[PDB]
């Protein structure tokens, strides 16, 4: 079962990329890769996580322009749905 986690990151770059899919009628955001010693990795962000929110805004209520601004700021919050570790 998947769990939902909150991540707050502070400062460069956050050390991760995102891919975007909209195939079931809702836009979804997924972590592509993570930099191992990156800022987000240190926070427990993992490749293949779904980003449910950025800065309390749903992935579906986001455009590239908002996300580019948010990731350029010295801080950022994420709501992430991820499989627990095994």
Curated annotation (Swiss-Prot):
The protein's PTM annotation reads:
Ubiquitinated.
Q: In which tissues is it expressed?
A: Found in virtually all analyzed tumor cell lines including B- and T-lymphomas, neuroblastomas, melanomas and carcinomas.
Q: Where in the cell is it found?
A: Cell junction; Cell membrane
From which residue to which does the signal peptide run?
A: none
Source domain of life: Eukaryota
Q: Which residues form the PDZ domain?
A: 6-64
Q: Which family does it belong to?
A: Belongs to the TIAM family.
The illness linked here is:
Neurodevelopmental disorder with language delay and seizures: An autosomal recessive disorder characterized by global developmental delay, intellectual disability, speech delay, and seizures. Additional features may include axial hypotonia, peripheral hypertonia, hypothyroidism, and non-specific dysmorphic features or brain imaging abnormalities.
Q: Please explain the role this protein plays, according to its UniProt record.
A: Guanyl-nucleotide exchange factor that activates RHO-like proteins and connects extracellular signals to cytoskeletal activities. Activates RAC1, CDC42, and to a lesser extent RHOA and their downstream signaling to regulate processes like cell adhesion and cell migration.
What is annotated about its quaternary structure and interactions? Component of the Par polarity complex, composed of at least phosphorylated PRKCZ, PARD3 and TIAM1. Interacts with NTRK2; mediates the activation of RAC1 by BDNF. Interacts with MAPK8IP2 and CD44. Interacts with BAIAP2. Interacts with EPHA8; regulates clathrin-mediated endocytosis of EPHA8. Interacts with PARD3. Interacts (via PDZ domain) with CNTNAP4, SDC1 and SDC3 (via C-terminus).
Give the comment on domains: The first PH domain mediates interaction with membranes enriched in phosphoinositides.
Q: What is this protein called?
A: Rho guanine nucleotide exchange factor TIAM1
The organism's lineage is: Eukaryota, Metazoa, Chordata, Craniata, Vertebrata
Encoded by which gene? Answer: TIAM1
């Amino acid at each position: 079962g998947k769990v939902t986690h909150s991540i707050h990151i502070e400062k460069d770059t956050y050390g991760f990329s995102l891919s975007s899919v909209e195939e079931d009628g809702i836009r979804r955001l997924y972590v592509n890769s993570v930099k191992e010693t990156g800022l987000a990795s240190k926070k427990g962000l993992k490749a293949g996580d779904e980003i449910l929110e950025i800065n309390n805004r749903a992935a579906d209520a986001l455009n590239s322009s908002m996300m580019e601004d948010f990731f350029s700021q010295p801080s950022v919050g994420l709501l992430v749905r991820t499989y627990p570790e095994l």
